Amino acid sequence: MIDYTAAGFTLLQGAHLYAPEDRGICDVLVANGKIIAVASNIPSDIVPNCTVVDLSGQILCPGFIDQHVHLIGGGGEAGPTTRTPEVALSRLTEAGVTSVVGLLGTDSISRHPESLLAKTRALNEEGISAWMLTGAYHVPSRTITGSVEKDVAIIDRVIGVKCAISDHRSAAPDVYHLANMAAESRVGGLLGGKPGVTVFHMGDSKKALQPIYDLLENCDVPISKLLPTHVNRNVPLFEQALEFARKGGTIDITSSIDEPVAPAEGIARAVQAGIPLARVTLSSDGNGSQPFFDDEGNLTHIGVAGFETLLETVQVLVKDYDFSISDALRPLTSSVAGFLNLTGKGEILPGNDADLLVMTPELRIEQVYARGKLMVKDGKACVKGTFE
Ligand SMILES: CC(C)C[C@H](CP(=O)(O)[C@@H](N)CC(=O)O)C(=O)O
Ligand SMILES: [Zn+2]
Numbered sequence: 001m002i003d004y005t006a007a008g009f010t011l012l013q014g015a016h017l018y019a020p021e022d023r024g025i026c027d028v029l030v031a032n033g034k035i036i037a038v039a040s041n042i043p044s045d046i047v048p049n050c051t052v053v054d055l056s057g058q059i060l061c062p063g064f065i066d067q068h069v070h071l072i073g074g075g076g077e078a079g080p081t082t083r084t085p086e087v088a089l090s091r092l093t094e095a096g097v098t099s100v101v102g103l104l105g106t107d108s109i110s111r112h113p114e115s116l117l118a119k120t121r122a123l124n125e126e127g128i129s130a131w132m133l134t135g136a137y138h139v140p141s142r143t144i145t146g147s148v149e150k151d152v153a154i155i156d157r158v159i160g161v162k163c164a165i166s167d168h169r170s171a172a173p174d175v176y177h178l179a180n181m182a183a184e185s186r187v188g189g190l191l192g193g194k195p196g197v198t199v200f201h202m203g204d205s206k207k208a209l210q211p212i213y214d215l216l217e218n219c220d221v222p223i224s225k226l227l228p229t230h231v232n233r234n235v236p237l238f239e240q241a242l243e244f245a246r247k248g249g250t251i252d253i254t255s256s257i258d259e260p261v262a263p264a265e266g267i268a269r270a271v272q273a274g275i276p277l278a279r280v281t282l283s284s285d286g287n288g289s290q291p292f293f294d295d296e297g298n299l300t301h302i303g304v305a306g307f308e309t310l311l312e313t314v315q316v317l318v319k320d321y322d323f324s325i326s327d328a329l330r331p332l333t334s335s336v337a338g339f340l341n342l343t344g345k346g347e348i349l350p351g352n353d354a355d356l357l358v359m360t361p362e363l364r365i366e367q368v369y370a371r372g373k374l375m376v377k378d379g380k381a382c383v384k385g386t387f388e
């Protein structure tokens with residue numbers, strides 16, 4: 001009778017596709033965790049043992065790429081009791097995230113990159129796709145092999161390096177150390193096929209983006225490799241961010257900060273400013289700590305950041321700021337996919353991974369496909385970690 005199960009065919013039809021481009025109502029044939037066909041009216045019987053999903057009435061779009069998640073945990077600013085746990089596969093998929101880039105933070109003493117690489121590989125095995133950034137806030141960077149350059153070049157899941165500047169938790173790095181680091185990651189990327197990016201944690205420091213502008217003057221690293229995150233933390237910074245974006249740089253906006261500049265507000269304000277969307281990205285900063293400080297560097301409150309804020313922003317964009325479901329999706333999909341050169345991600349077209357999300361017209365996640373495997377059903381995850 002013949003068996004074609006290994007192929008795992010899947011016909012997702014009758015959905016209003018946003019790839020993100022508004023592609024009207026059309027189908028998507030998925031086989032081997034890959035999108036093998038996108039057109040309207042793919043014959044229900046074009047292939048054997050195919051599984052058809054009557055998505056008629058729902059919306060289909062690419063999964064999310066969260067390039068800022070503390071996969072193994074974070075916090076620690078207020079003692080050992082403030083060490084946030086690790087993230088569970090479920091609260092990721094269940095949040096529309098299919099691709100994620102993990103990093104460390106303030107704590108590099110009781111958090112090592114070697115155990116971040118692990119979770120990263122775990123999260124891969126279990127379904128989604130993960131990558132990590134070497135080092136953390138501390139500069140010189142605390143690596144895995146002893147060289148930012150060597151790390152990015154040889155450890156497969158390392159695509160860049162992270163550091164922290166203009167914050168009272170920085171190691172007070174100087175132009176040189178900052179520049180050297182930034183360059184090792186670029187070349188590392190060149191050798192290993194990684195993006196070679198340098199993510200910069202930003203702080204409420206008066207100096208703002210000064211270190212970056214300075215670093216540009218002290219080396220030759222392409223501005224297209226310098227990513228300032230958390231840019232929405234304070235007004236004077238966000239405005240310099242735009243100016244940085246106007247010179248050709250990409251800026252990462254954290255959706256876990258609701259004031260003084262909302263994520264939704266932030267993104268819109270950038271478009272109106274004239275920045276294209278391909279230079280704007282939204283990160284979550286999952287499982288990270290939300291600590292606040294007064295004027296003497298005293299910590300007052302502290303908590304944890306969740307992922308719910310990604311979709312919210314997207315919703316608050318379509319409504320309120322009169323965007324298109326399409327443009328509103330870009331900052332979490334095609335934009336991020338282009339900045340970190342992630343292939344098979346960000347766009348729905350023949351050849352890329354079946355990282356798909358099924359939502360109601362009102363933008364409520366109902367189903368989440370990750371590289372083909374069904375991860376979320378009816379709004380609740382149907383595939384959890386290994387020890388959840
Ligand atoms: C925006 C602000 C309220 C929170 C940010 C979050 P973060 O840099 O990601 C830090 N929580 C990461 C970590 O856990 O080390 C901060 O610590 O400055
Ligand atoms: Zn940070």
Ligand SMILES: [Zn+2]
Nearest residue numbers: 068105285288
């Ligand atoms: Zn962070």
